[PDB]
Structures are given as C-alpha cells and as structure tokens.
mmCIF file with all atom_site columns, N, CA and C in Angstrom:
data_model
loop_
_atom_site.group_PDB
_atom_site.id
_atom_site.type_symbol
_atom_site.label_atom_id
_atom_site.label_alt_id
_atom_site.label_comp_id
_atom_site.label_asym_id
_atom_site.label_entity_id
_atom_site.label_seq_id
_atom_site.pdbx_PDB_ins_code
_atom_site.Cartn_x
_atom_site.Cartn_y
_atom_site.Cartn_z
_atom_site.occupancy
_atom_site.B_iso_or_equiv
_atom_site.pdbx_formal_charge
_atom_site.auth_seq_id
_atom_site.auth_comp_id
_atom_site.auth_asym_id
_atom_site.auth_atom_id
_atom_site.pdbx_PDB_model_num
ATOM 1   N N  . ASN A 1 1  ? 121.895 6.667   -9.117  1.00 0.00 ? 1  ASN A N  1
ATOM 2   C CA . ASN A 1 1  ? 120.728 7.977   -9.228  1.00 0.00 ? 1  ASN A CA 1
ATOM 3   C C  . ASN A 1 1  ? 119.685 7.576   -7.982  1.00 0.00 ? 1  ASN A C  1
ATOM 4   N N  . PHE A 1 2  ? 119.067 8.619   -7.160  1.00 0.00 ? 2  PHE A N  1
ATOM 5   C CA . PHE A 1 2  ? 118.101 8.557   -5.771  1.00 0.00 ? 2  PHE A CA 1
ATOM 6   C C  . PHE A 1 2  ? 116.360 9.230   -6.933  1.00 0.00 ? 2  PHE A C  1
ATOM 7   N N  . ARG A 1 3  ? 115.925 8.427   -6.242  1.00 0.00 ? 3  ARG A N  1
ATOM 8   C CA . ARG A 1 3  ? 114.276 8.349   -5.584  1.00 0.00 ? 3  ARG A CA 1
ATOM 9   C C  . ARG A 1 3  ? 113.673 7.892   -5.150  1.00 0.00 ? 3  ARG A C  1
ATOM 10  N N  . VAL A 1 4  ? 112.808 8.698   -5.030  1.00 0.00 ? 4  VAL A N  1
ATOM 11  C CA . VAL A 1 4  ? 111.637 8.431   -4.193  1.00 0.00 ? 4  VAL A CA 1
ATOM 12  C C  . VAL A 1 4  ? 110.108 7.326   -4.321  1.00 0.00 ? 4  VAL A C  1
ATOM 13  N N  . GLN A 1 5  ? 110.595 6.253   -4.093  1.00 0.00 ? 5  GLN A N  1
ATOM 14  C CA . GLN A 1 5  ? 109.286 5.194   -4.544  1.00 0.00 ? 5  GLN A CA 1
ATOM 15  C C  . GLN A 1 5  ? 107.715 5.330   -3.520  1.00 0.00 ? 5  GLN A C  1
ATOM 16  N N  . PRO A 1 6  ? 106.855 5.793   -4.645  1.00 0.00 ? 6  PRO A N  1
ATOM 17  C CA . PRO A 1 6  ? 105.470 6.053   -4.271  1.00 0.00 ? 6  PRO A CA 1
ATOM 18  C C  . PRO A 1 6  ? 105.209 5.855   -3.411  1.00 0.00 ? 6  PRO A C  1
ATOM 19  N N  . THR A 1 7  ? 104.313 6.080   -1.935  1.00 0.00 ? 7  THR A N  1
ATOM 20  C CA . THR A 1 7  ? 104.108 6.386   -0.928  1.00 0.00 ? 7  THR A CA 1
ATOM 21  C C  . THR A 1 7  ? 103.156 4.954   -0.666  1.00 0.00 ? 7  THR A C  1
ATOM 22  N N  . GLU A 1 8  ? 101.728 4.954   -1.853  1.00 0.00 ? 8  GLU A N  1
ATOM 23  C CA . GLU A 1 8  ? 100.756 4.441   -2.269  1.00 0.00 ? 8  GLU A CA 1
ATOM 24  C C  . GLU A 1 8  ? 100.236 5.049   -4.116  1.00 0.00 ? 8  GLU A C  1
ATOM 25  N N  . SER A 1 9  ? 99.773  3.513   -4.375  1.00 0.00 ? 9  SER A N  1
ATOM 26  C CA . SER A 1 9  ? 99.240  3.858   -5.135  1.00 0.00 ? 9  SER A CA 1
ATOM 27  C C  . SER A 1 9  ? 97.794  3.908   -5.260  1.00 0.00 ? 9  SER A C  1
ATOM 28  N N  . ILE A 1 10 ? 96.933  4.829   -5.826  1.00 0.00 ? 10 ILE A N  1
ATOM 29  C CA . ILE A 1 10 ? 95.633  5.881   -5.752  1.00 0.00 ? 10 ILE A CA 1
ATOM 30  C C  . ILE A 1 10 ? 95.060  5.345   -7.324  1.00 0.00 ? 10 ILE A C  1
ATOM 31  N N  . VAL A 1 11 ? 93.911  4.797   -7.885  1.00 0.00 ? 11 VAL A N  1
ATOM 32  C CA . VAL A 1 11 ? 93.225  4.312   -8.853  1.00 0.00 ? 11 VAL A CA 1
ATOM 33  C C  . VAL A 1 11 ? 91.520  5.521   -8.623  1.00 0.00 ? 11 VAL A C  1
ATOM 34  N N  . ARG A 1 12 ? 91.560  6.398   -9.592  1.00 0.00 ? 12 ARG A N  1
ATOM 35  C CA . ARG A 1 12 ? 90.487  7.133   -9.345  1.00 0.00 ? 12 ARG A CA 1
ATOM 36  C C  . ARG A 1 12 ? 89.965  6.968   -11.121 1.00 0.00 ? 12 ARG A C  1
ATOM 37  N N  . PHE A 1 13 ? 88.524  7.132   -10.555 1.00 0.00 ? 13 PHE A N  1
ATOM 38  C CA . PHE A 1 13 ? 87.812  6.455   -12.513 1.00 0.00 ? 13 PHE A CA 1
ATOM 39  C C  . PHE A 1 13 ? 86.738  8.067   -11.772 1.00 0.00 ? 13 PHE A C  1
ATOM 40  N N  . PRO A 1 14 ? 85.904  8.067   -13.266 1.00 0.00 ? 14 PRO A N  1
ATOM 41  C CA . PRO A 1 14 ? 84.968  8.854   -13.270 1.00 0.00 ? 14 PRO A CA 1
ATOM 42  C C  . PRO A 1 14 ? 83.505  8.111   -12.569 1.00 0.00 ? 14 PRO A C  1
ATOM 43  N N  . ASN A 1 15 ? 83.093  9.007   -11.538 1.00 0.00 ? 15 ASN A N  1
ATOM 44  C CA . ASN A 1 15 ? 81.953  8.584   -11.044 1.00 0.00 ? 15 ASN A CA 1
ATOM 45  C C  . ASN A 1 15 ? 81.155  8.249   -11.900 1.00 0.00 ? 15 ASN A C  1
ATOM 46  N N  . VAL A 1 16 ? 80.087  6.963   -11.615 1.00 0.00 ? 16 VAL A N  1
ATOM 47  C CA . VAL A 1 16 ? 79.253  7.023   -12.758 1.00 0.00 ? 16 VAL A CA 1
ATOM 48  C C  . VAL A 1 16 ? 78.116  6.680   -12.292 1.00 0.00 ? 16 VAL A C  1
ATOM 49  N N  . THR A 1 17 ? 76.930  7.277   -13.182 1.00 0.00 ? 17 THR A N  1
ATOM 50  C CA . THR A 1 17 ? 75.195  6.811   -12.801 1.00 0.00 ? 17 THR A CA 1
ATOM 51  C C  . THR A 1 17 ? 74.500  6.690   -13.904 1.00 0.00 ? 17 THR A C  1
ATOM 52  N N  . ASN A 1 18 ? 75.041  5.785   -14.677 1.00 0.00 ? 18 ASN A N  1
ATOM 53  C CA . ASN A 1 18 ? 74.223  5.152   -15.837 1.00 0.00 ? 18 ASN A CA 1
ATOM 54  C C  . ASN A 1 18 ? 72.988  4.497   -15.024 1.00 0.00 ? 18 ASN A C  1
ATOM 55  N N  . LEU A 1 19 ? 73.355  3.627   -14.351 1.00 0.00 ? 19 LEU A N  1
ATOM 56  C CA . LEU A 1 19 ? 72.255  2.859   -13.755 1.00 0.00 ? 19 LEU A CA 1
ATOM 57  C C  . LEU A 1 19 ? 71.008  2.421   -14.479 1.00 0.00 ? 19 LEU A C  1
ATOM 58  N N  . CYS A 1 20 ? 71.837  1.436   -14.499 1.00 0.00 ? 20 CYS A N  1
ATOM 59  C CA . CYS A 1 20 ? 70.702  0.601   -16.140 1.00 0.00 ? 20 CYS A CA 1
ATOM 60  C C  . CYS A 1 20 ? 69.671  0.208   -15.069 1.00 0.00 ? 20 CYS A C  1
ATOM 61  N N  . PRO A 1 21 ? 68.706  -0.068  -15.879 1.00 0.00 ? 21 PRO A N  1
ATOM 62  C CA . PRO A 1 21 ? 66.941  -0.726  -15.403 1.00 0.00 ? 21 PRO A CA 1
ATOM 63  C C  . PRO A 1 21 ? 67.257  -2.026  -14.755 1.00 0.00 ? 21 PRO A C  1
ATOM 64  N N  . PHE A 1 22 ? 68.360  -2.384  -14.668 1.00 0.00 ? 22 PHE A N  1
ATOM 65  C CA . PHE A 1 22 ? 68.485  -3.830  -13.669 1.00 0.00 ? 22 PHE A CA 1
ATOM 66  C C  . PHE A 1 22 ? 67.686  -4.372  -12.774 1.00 0.00 ? 22 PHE A C  1
ATOM 67  N N  . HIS A 1 23 ? 67.538  -3.471  -11.825 1.00 0.00 ? 23 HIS A N  1
ATOM 68  C CA . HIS A 1 23 ? 66.317  -3.616  -10.888 1.00 0.00 ? 23 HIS A CA 1
ATOM 69  C C  . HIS A 1 23 ? 64.854  -3.209  -11.415 1.00 0.00 ? 23 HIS A C  1
ATOM 70  N N  . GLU A 1 24 ? 64.689  -3.097  -12.843 1.00 0.00 ? 24 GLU A N  1
ATOM 71  C CA . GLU A 1 24 ? 63.841  -2.609  -13.137 1.00 0.00 ? 24 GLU A CA 1
ATOM 72  C C  . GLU A 1 24 ? 63.378  -4.136  -13.905 1.00 0.00 ? 24 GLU A C  1
ATOM 73  N N  . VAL A 1 25 ? 64.185  -4.809  -14.121 1.00 0.00 ? 25 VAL A N  1
ATOM 74  C CA . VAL A 1 25 ? 63.760  -6.523  -14.593 1.00 0.00 ? 25 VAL A CA 1
ATOM 75  C C  . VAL A 1 25 ? 64.349  -7.299  -13.797 1.00 0.00 ? 25 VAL A C  1
ATOM 76  N N  . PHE A 1 26 ? 64.302  -7.218  -12.624 1.00 0.00 ? 26 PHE A N  1
ATOM 77  C CA . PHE A 1 26 ? 64.161  -7.822  -11.602 1.00 0.00 ? 26 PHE A CA 1
ATOM 78  C C  . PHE A 1 26 ? 63.518  -8.023  -10.538 1.00 0.00 ? 26 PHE A C  1
ATOM 79  N N  . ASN A 1 27 ? 62.111  -7.407  -10.644 1.00 0.00 ? 27 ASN A N  1
ATOM 80  C CA . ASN A 1 27 ? 61.519  -7.422  -9.912  1.00 0.00 ? 27 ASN A CA 1
ATOM 81  C C  . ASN A 1 27 ? 59.551  -7.298  -10.894 1.00 0.00 ? 27 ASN A C  1
ATOM 82  N N  . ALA A 1 28 ? 59.683  -7.459  -11.556 1.00 0.00 ? 28 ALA A N  1
ATOM 83  C CA . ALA A 1 28 ? 58.784  -6.991  -12.369 1.00 0.00 ? 28 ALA A CA 1
ATOM 84  C C  . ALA A 1 28 ? 57.622  -8.553  -12.041 1.00 0.00 ? 28 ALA A C  1
ATOM 85  N N  . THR A 1 29 ? 56.707  -9.000  -12.179 1.00 0.00 ? 29 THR A N  1
ATOM 86  C CA . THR A 1 29 ? 55.132  -9.757  -12.118 1.00 0.00 ? 29 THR A CA 1
ATOM 87  C C  . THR A 1 29 ? 55.023  -10.155 -13.224 1.00 0.00 ? 29 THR A C  1
ATOM 88  N N  . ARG A 1 30 ? 54.410  -9.183  -14.276 1.00 0.00 ? 30 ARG A N  1
ATOM 89  C CA . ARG A 1 30 ? 53.643  -9.375  -15.209 1.00 0.00 ? 30 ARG A CA 1
ATOM 90  C C  . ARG A 1 30 ? 54.510  -9.990  -16.546 1.00 0.00 ? 30 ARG A C  1
ATOM 91  N N  . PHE A 1 31 ? 55.661  -11.033 -16.191 1.00 0.00 ? 31 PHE A N  1
ATOM 92  C CA . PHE A 1 31 ? 56.519  -12.127 -16.883 1.00 0.00 ? 31 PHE A CA 1
ATOM 93  C C  . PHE A 1 31 ? 55.355  -12.759 -18.231 1.00 0.00 ? 31 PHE A C  1
ATOM 94  N N  . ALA A 1 32 ? 55.933  -11.835 -19.483 1.00 0.00 ? 32 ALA A N  1
ATOM 95  C CA . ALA A 1 32 ? 54.455  -13.301 -20.548 1.00 0.00 ? 32 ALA A CA 1
ATOM 96  C C  . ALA A 1 32 ? 55.700  -14.838 -20.700 1.00 0.00 ? 32 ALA A C  1
ATOM 97  N N  . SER A 1 33 ? 55.787  -15.183 -21.490 1.00 0.00 ? 33 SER A N  1
ATOM 98  C CA . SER A 1 33 ? 55.677  -16.514 -21.851 1.00 0.00 ? 33 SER A CA 1
ATOM 99  C C  . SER A 1 33 ? 57.392  -16.723 -21.978 1.00 0.00 ? 33 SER A C  1
ATOM 100 N N  . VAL A 1 34 ? 57.540  -17.805 -22.567 1.00 0.00 ? 34 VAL A N  1
ATOM 101 C CA . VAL A 1 34 ? 58.809  -18.092 -22.868 1.00 0.00 ? 34 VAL A CA 1
ATOM 102 C C  . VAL A 1 34 ? 59.441  -17.497 -24.278 1.00 0.00 ? 34 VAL A C  1
ATOM 103 N N  . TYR A 1 35 ? 58.352  -18.373 -24.906 1.00 0.00 ? 35 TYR A N  1
ATOM 104 C CA . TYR A 1 35 ? 58.957  -18.204 -26.843 1.00 0.00 ? 35 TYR A CA 1
ATOM 105 C C  . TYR A 1 35 ? 58.894  -16.572 -27.045 1.00 0.00 ? 35 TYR A C  1
ATOM 106 N N  . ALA A 1 36 ? 57.999  -15.651 -26.696 1.00 0.00 ? 36 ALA A N  1
ATOM 107 C CA . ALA A 1 36 ? 58.115  -14.233 -26.373 1.00 0.00 ? 36 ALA A CA 1
ATOM 108 C C  . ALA A 1 36 ? 58.878  -13.677 -25.552 1.00 0.00 ? 36 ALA A C  1
ATOM 109 N N  . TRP A 1 37 ? 59.896  -13.609 -25.871 1.00 0.00 ? 37 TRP A N  1
ATOM 110 C CA . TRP A 1 37 ? 60.935  -12.951 -25.106 1.00 0.00 ? 37 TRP A CA 1
ATOM 111 C C  . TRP A 1 37 ? 61.972  -11.578 -25.549 1.00 0.00 ? 37 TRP A C  1
ATOM 112 N N  . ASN A 1 38 ? 62.075  -10.846 -25.068 1.00 0.00 ? 38 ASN A N  1
ATOM 113 C CA . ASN A 1 38 ? 62.686  -9.643  -24.841 1.00 0.00 ? 38 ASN A CA 1
ATOM 114 C C  . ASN A 1 38 ? 64.223  -9.208  -25.397 1.00 0.00 ? 38 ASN A C  1
ATOM 115 N N  . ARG A 1 39 ? 64.547  -8.483  -26.471 1.00 0.00 ? 39 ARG A N  1
ATOM 116 C CA . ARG A 1 39 ? 65.593  -8.220  -26.354 1.00 0.00 ? 39 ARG A CA 1
ATOM 117 C C  . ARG A 1 39 ? 65.574  -6.554  -25.979 1.00 0.00 ? 39 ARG A C  1
ATOM 118 N N  . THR A 1 40 ? 66.608  -6.727  -24.322 1.00 0.00 ? 40 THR A N  1
ATOM 119 C CA . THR A 1 40 ? 66.486  -5.639  -23.691 1.00 0.00 ? 40 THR A CA 1
ATOM 120 C C  . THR A 1 40 ? 67.956  -4.956  -24.104 1.00 0.00 ? 40 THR A C  1
ATOM 121 N N  . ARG A 1 41 ? 68.017  -3.759  -24.870 1.00 0.00 ? 41 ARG A N  1
ATOM 122 C CA . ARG A 1 41 ? 69.249  -2.637  -25.417 1.00 0.00 ? 41 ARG A CA 1
ATOM 123 C C  . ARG A 1 41 ? 69.683  -2.238  -23.721 1.00 0.00 ? 41 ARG A C  1
ATOM 124 N N  . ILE A 1 42 ? 70.764  -3.230  -23.345 1.00 0.00 ? 42 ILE A N  1
ATOM 125 C CA . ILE A 1 42 ? 71.521  -2.351  -22.648 1.00 0.00 ? 42 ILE A CA 1
ATOM 126 C C  . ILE A 1 42 ? 72.470  -1.832  -23.059 1.00 0.00 ? 42 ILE A C  1
ATOM 127 N N  . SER A 1 43 ? 71.978  -0.064  -23.292 1.00 0.00 ? 43 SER A N  1
ATOM 128 C CA . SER A 1 43 ? 73.280  0.972   -24.025 1.00 0.00 ? 43 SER A CA 1
ATOM 129 C C  . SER A 1 43 ? 73.283  1.735   -22.960 1.00 0.00 ? 43 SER A C  1
ATOM 130 N N  . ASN A 1 44 ? 74.788  1.965   -22.950 1.00 0.00 ? 44 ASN A N  1
ATOM 131 C CA . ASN A 1 44 ? 75.127  3.104   -22.415 1.00 0.00 ? 44 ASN A CA 1
ATOM 132 C C  . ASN A 1 44 ? 74.941  3.174   -21.068 1.00 0.00 ? 44 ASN A C  1
ATOM 133 N N  . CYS A 1 45 ? 75.116  1.777   -20.415 1.00 0.00 ? 45 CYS A N  1
ATOM 134 C CA . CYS A 1 45 ? 74.924  1.462   -19.021 1.00 0.00 ? 45 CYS A CA 1
ATOM 135 C C  . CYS A 1 45 ? 75.809  1.378   -17.795 1.00 0.00 ? 45 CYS A C  1
ATOM 136 N N  . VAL A 1 46 ? 75.439  0.756   -17.123 1.00 0.00 ? 46 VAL A N  1
ATOM 137 C CA . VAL A 1 46 ? 77.118  0.373   -16.141 1.00 0.00 ? 46 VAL A CA 1
ATOM 138 C C  . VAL A 1 46 ? 77.066  -0.825  -15.072 1.00 0.00 ? 46 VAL A C  1
ATOM 139 N N  . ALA A 1 47 ? 77.696  -1.636  -15.261 1.00 0.00 ? 47 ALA A N  1
ATOM 140 C CA . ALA A 1 47 ? 77.765  -3.118  -15.477 1.00 0.00 ? 47 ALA A CA 1
ATOM 141 C C  . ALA A 1 47 ? 77.640  -3.336  -13.841 1.00 0.00 ? 47 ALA A C  1
ATOM 142 N N  . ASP A 1 48 ? 77.016  -2.848  -13.419 1.00 0.00 ? 48 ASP A N  1
ATOM 143 C CA . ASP A 1 48 ? 76.741  -2.506  -11.705 1.00 0.00 ? 48 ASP A CA 1
ATOM 144 C C  . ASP A 1 48 ? 76.248  -4.215  -11.625 1.00 0.00 ? 48 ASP A C  1
ATOM 145 N N  . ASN B 2 1  ? 66.754  18.393  -32.943 1.00 0.00 ? 1  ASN B N  1
ATOM 146 C CA . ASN B 2 1  ? 66.283  19.367  -32.209 1.00 0.00 ? 1  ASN B CA 1
ATOM 147 C C  . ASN B 2 1  ? 65.312  19.763  -31.503 1.00 0.00 ? 1  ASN B C  1
ATOM 148 N N  . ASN B 2 2  ? 64.845  20.699  -30.546 1.00 0.00 ? 2  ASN B N  1
ATOM 149 C CA . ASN B 2 2  ? 63.764  21.351  -30.241 1.00 0.00 ? 2  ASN B CA 1
ATOM 150 C C  . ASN B 2 2  ? 63.972  22.326  -29.033 1.00 0.00 ? 2  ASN B C  1
ATOM 151 N N  . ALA B 2 3  ? 62.968  23.011  -28.625 1.00 0.00 ? 3  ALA B N  1
ATOM 152 C CA . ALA B 2 3  ? 62.991  23.890  -27.927 1.00 0.00 ? 3  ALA B CA 1
ATOM 153 C C  . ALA B 2 3  ? 63.908  23.964  -26.760 1.00 0.00 ? 3  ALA B C  1
ATOM 154 N N  . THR B 2 4  ? 63.637  22.614  -26.126 1.00 0.00 ? 4  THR B N  1
ATOM 155 C CA . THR B 2 4  ? 64.256  22.891  -24.729 1.00 0.00 ? 4  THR B CA 1
ATOM 156 C C  . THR B 2 4  ? 65.105  21.478  -24.565 1.00 0.00 ? 4  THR B C  1
ATOM 157 N N  . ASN B 2 5  ? 65.104  21.074  -25.478 1.00 0.00 ? 5  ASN B N  1
ATOM 158 C CA . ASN B 2 5  ? 66.616  19.932  -25.606 1.00 0.00 ? 5  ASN B CA 1
ATOM 159 C C  . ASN B 2 5  ? 66.776  19.412  -26.817 1.00 0.00 ? 5  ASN B C  1
ATOM 160 N N  . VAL B 2 6  ? 67.563  18.148  -26.867 1.00 0.00 ? 6  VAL B N  1
ATOM 161 C CA . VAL B 2 6  ? 68.236  17.946  -28.384 1.00 0.00 ? 6  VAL B CA 1
ATOM 162 C C  . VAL B 2 6  ? 67.553  16.220  -27.886 1.00 0.00 ? 6  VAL B C  1
ATOM 163 N N  . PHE B 2 7  ? 67.352  16.009  -29.926 1.00 0.00 ? 7  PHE B N  1
ATOM 164 C CA . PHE B 2 7  ? 67.216  14.229  -29.695 1.00 0.00 ? 7  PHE B CA 1
ATOM 165 C C  . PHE B 2 7  ? 67.931  13.770  -30.498 1.00 0.00 ? 7  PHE B C  1
ATOM 166 N N  . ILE B 2 8  ? 68.846  12.523  -30.075 1.00 0.00 ? 8  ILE B N  1
ATOM 167 C CA . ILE B 2 8  ? 69.605  11.759  -31.089 1.00 0.00 ? 8  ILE B CA 1
ATOM 168 C C  . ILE B 2 8  ? 69.268  10.592  -30.817 1.00 0.00 ? 8  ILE B C  1
ATOM 169 N N  . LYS B 2 9  ? 68.679  9.621   -31.615 1.00 0.00 ? 9  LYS B N  1
ATOM 170 C CA . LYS B 2 9  ? 68.970  7.903   -32.115 1.00 0.00 ? 9  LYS B CA 1
ATOM 171 C C  . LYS B 2 9  ? 69.726  7.655   -33.545 1.00 0.00 ? 9  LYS B C  1
ATOM 172 N N  . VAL B 2 10 ? 69.268  6.646   -33.098 1.00 0.00 ? 10 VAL B N  1
ATOM 173 C CA . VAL B 2 10 ? 70.356  5.449   -34.262 1.00 0.00 ? 10 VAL B CA 1
ATOM 174 C C  . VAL B 2 10 ? 68.867  4.532   -34.604 1.00 0.00 ? 10 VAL B C  1
ATOM 175 N N  . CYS B 2 11 ? 68.686  5.291   -35.322 1.00 0.00 ? 11 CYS B N  1
ATOM 176 C CA . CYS B 2 11 ? 67.270  4.068   -36.160 1.00 0.00 ? 11 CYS B CA 1
ATOM 177 C C  . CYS B 2 11 ? 67.471  3.641   -37.395 1.00 0.00 ? 11 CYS B C  1
ATOM 178 N N  . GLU B 2 12 ? 66.721  3.297   -38.127 1.00 0.00 ? 12 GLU B N  1
ATOM 179 C CA . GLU B 2 12 ? 66.282  2.985   -39.350 1.00 0.00 ? 12 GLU B CA 1
ATOM 180 C C  . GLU B 2 12 ? 65.752  4.579   -40.342 1.00 0.00 ? 12 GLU B C  1
ATOM 181 N N  . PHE B 2 13 ? 65.277  5.135   -40.249 1.00 0.00 ? 13 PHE B N  1
ATOM 182 C CA . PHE B 2 13 ? 64.915  6.141   -40.547 1.00 0.00 ? 13 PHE B CA 1
ATOM 183 C C  . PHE B 2 13 ? 64.992  6.421   -42.020 1.00 0.00 ? 13 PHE B C  1
ATOM 184 N N  . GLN B 2 14 ? 63.596  5.718   -42.357 1.00 0.00 ? 14 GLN B N  1
ATOM 185 C CA . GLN B 2 14 ? 63.112  5.756   -44.185 1.00 0.00 ? 14 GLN B CA 1
ATOM 186 C C  . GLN B 2 14 ? 62.995  6.847   -44.764 1.00 0.00 ? 14 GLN B C  1
ATOM 187 N N  . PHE B 2 15 ? 62.467  7.948   -44.602 1.00 0.00 ? 15 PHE B N  1
ATOM 188 C CA . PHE B 2 15 ? 62.563  9.070   -44.933 1.00 0.00 ? 15 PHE B CA 1
ATOM 189 C C  . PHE B 2 15 ? 61.157  10.001  -44.397 1.00 0.00 ? 15 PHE B C  1
ATOM 190 N N  . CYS B 2 16 ? 61.702  11.344  -44.517 1.00 0.00 ? 16 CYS B N  1
ATOM 191 C CA . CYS B 2 16 ? 60.499  12.519  -44.138 1.00 0.00 ? 16 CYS B CA 1
ATOM 192 C C  . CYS B 2 16 ? 59.683  13.199  -45.239 1.00 0.00 ? 16 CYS B C  1
ATOM 193 N N  . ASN B 2 17 ? 60.680  13.496  -46.001 1.00 0.00 ? 17 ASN B N  1
ATOM 194 C CA . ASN B 2 17 ? 60.784  14.502  -47.140 1.00 0.00 ? 17 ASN B CA 1
ATOM 195 C C  . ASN B 2 17 ? 59.440  15.947  -46.769 1.00 0.00 ? 17 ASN B C  1
ATOM 196 N N  . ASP B 2 18 ? 59.991  16.589  -45.639 1.00 0.00 ? 18 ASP B N  1
ATOM 197 C CA . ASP B 2 18 ? 58.867  17.362  -44.971 1.00 0.00 ? 18 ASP B CA 1
ATOM 198 C C  . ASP B 2 18 ? 60.088  18.396  -43.972 1.00 0.00 ? 18 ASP B C  1
ATOM 199 N N  . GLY B 2 19 ? 57.966  13.561  -35.530 1.00 0.00 ? 19 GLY B N  1
ATOM 200 C CA . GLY B 2 19 ? 57.295  12.622  -36.140 1.00 0.00 ? 19 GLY B CA 1
ATOM 201 C C  . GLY B 2 19 ? 57.929  12.968  -37.823 1.00 0.00 ? 19 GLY B C  1
ATOM 202 N N  . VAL B 2 20 ? 58.880  13.145  -37.740 1.00 0.00 ? 20 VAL B N  1
ATOM 203 C CA . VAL B 2 20 ? 60.079  13.047  -39.093 1.00 0.00 ? 20 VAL B CA 1
ATOM 204 C C  . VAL B 2 20 ? 60.055  12.388  -39.674 1.00 0.00 ? 20 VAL B C  1
ATOM 205 N N  . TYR B 2 21 ? 60.825  11.143  -38.741 1.00 0.00 ? 21 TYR B N  1
ATOM 206 C CA . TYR B 2 21 ? 60.538  9.647   -39.212 1.00 0.00 ? 21 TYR B CA 1
ATOM 207 C C  . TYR B 2 21 ? 59.531  8.710   -39.336 1.00 0.00 ? 21 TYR B C  1
ATOM 208 N N  . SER B 2 22 ? 59.537  7.456   -39.962 1.00 0.00 ? 22 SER B N  1
ATOM 209 C CA . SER B 2 22 ? 58.526  6.790   -40.097 1.00 0.00 ? 22 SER B CA 1
ATOM 210 C C  . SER B 2 22 ? 58.691  5.090   -40.058 1.00 0.00 ? 22 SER B C  1
ATOM 211 N N  . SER B 2 23 ? 59.817  4.760   -39.192 1.00 0.00 ? 23 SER B N  1
ATOM 212 C CA . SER B 2 23 ? 60.370  3.431   -38.984 1.00 0.00 ? 23 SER B CA 1
ATOM 213 C C  . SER B 2 23 ? 61.298  3.860   -37.929 1.00 0.00 ? 23 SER B C  1
ATOM 214 N N  . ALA B 2 24 ? 61.509  2.280   -37.420 1.00 0.00 ? 24 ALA B N  1
ATOM 215 C CA . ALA B 2 24 ? 62.239  1.901   -36.227 1.00 0.00 ? 24 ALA B CA 1
ATOM 216 C C  . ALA B 2 24 ? 62.431  0.696   -36.308 1.00 0.00 ? 24 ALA B C  1
ATOM 217 N N  . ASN B 2 25 ? 63.982  0.218   -36.435 1.00 0.00 ? 25 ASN B N  1
ATOM 218 C CA . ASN B 2 25 ? 64.443  -0.898  -36.632 1.00 0.00 ? 25 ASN B CA 1
ATOM 219 C C  . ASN B 2 25 ? 66.042  -0.420  -35.970 1.00 0.00 ? 25 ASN B C  1
ATOM 220 N N  . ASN B 2 26 ? 66.301  -1.868  -34.944 1.00 0.00 ? 26 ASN B N  1
ATOM 221 C CA . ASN B 2 26 ? 67.372  -1.551  -34.436 1.00 0.00 ? 26 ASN B CA 1
ATOM 222 C C  . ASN B 2 26 ? 67.417  -0.389  -33.810 1.00 0.00 ? 26 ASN B C  1
ATOM 223 N N  . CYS B 2 27 ? 66.801  0.080   -33.007 1.00 0.00 ? 27 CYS B N  1
ATOM 224 C CA . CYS B 2 27 ? 66.679  1.520   -32.392 1.00 0.00 ? 27 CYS B CA 1
ATOM 225 C C  . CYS B 2 27 ? 67.427  1.481   -30.957 1.00 0.00 ? 27 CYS B C  1
ATOM 226 N N  . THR B 2 28 ? 68.850  1.582   -31.397 1.00 0.00 ? 28 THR B N  1
ATOM 227 C CA . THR B 2 28 ? 69.721  2.244   -30.128 1.00 0.00 ? 28 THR B CA 1
ATOM 228 C C  . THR B 2 28 ? 70.205  3.468   -29.574 1.00 0.00 ? 28 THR B C  1
ATOM 229 N N  . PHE B 2 29 ? 70.549  4.272   -28.682 1.00 0.00 ? 29 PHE B N  1
ATOM 230 C CA . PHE B 2 29 ? 71.474  5.059   -28.566 1.00 0.00 ? 29 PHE B CA 1
ATOM 231 C C  . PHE B 2 29 ? 70.261  6.475   -28.585 1.00 0.00 ? 29 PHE B C  1
ATOM 232 N N  . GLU B 2 30 ? 69.822  6.396   -27.671 1.00 0.00 ? 30 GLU B N  1
ATOM 233 C CA . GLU B 2 30 ? 68.473  7.860   -27.362 1.00 0.00 ? 30 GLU B CA 1
ATOM 234 C C  . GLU B 2 30 ? 69.790  8.844   -26.657 1.00 0.00 ? 30 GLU B C  1
#
C-alpha cells in the first residue's frame, strides 16, 4: 500500500482569555503580615 | 438569574424560605 506522509504536524487549541489576576497579586503594596495569609481561589483561570 | 444576566455560584447556601442566601463558605465558581 502507498500513503502520503503528513507534510507537517499542526497542533491547535482554543484561544484562552481567562487571564487570572497573577499580575494583581504581583504588584500589590499593602501586603499584610505573615500569620494572616489569604487563600486565593485560582478558579477557571489560565496557568500562564 | 435576573433581568440582564445570570448568577451561578457554589457556596454553602444555608436557607432562604423566601439576598436569597445568608452564608458564604468555600465560595467557588462564581
């Protein structure tokens, strides 16, 4: 049997626009003490 | 839901019997 080998491999995924506020927790100035730490809910985000 | 959009949340949701909810624990997926 004869086949044409694929010319190239292309991977395509849906464009992501979750944009989790990682920048929002990386520019804050009013950080509190150590014993009182948030538990920020990283939900329906993108791990960028 | 309401007039212009929808409101989906996953919280404790104690009770309304009628600002429907009056509790907030492990509030995820707004």
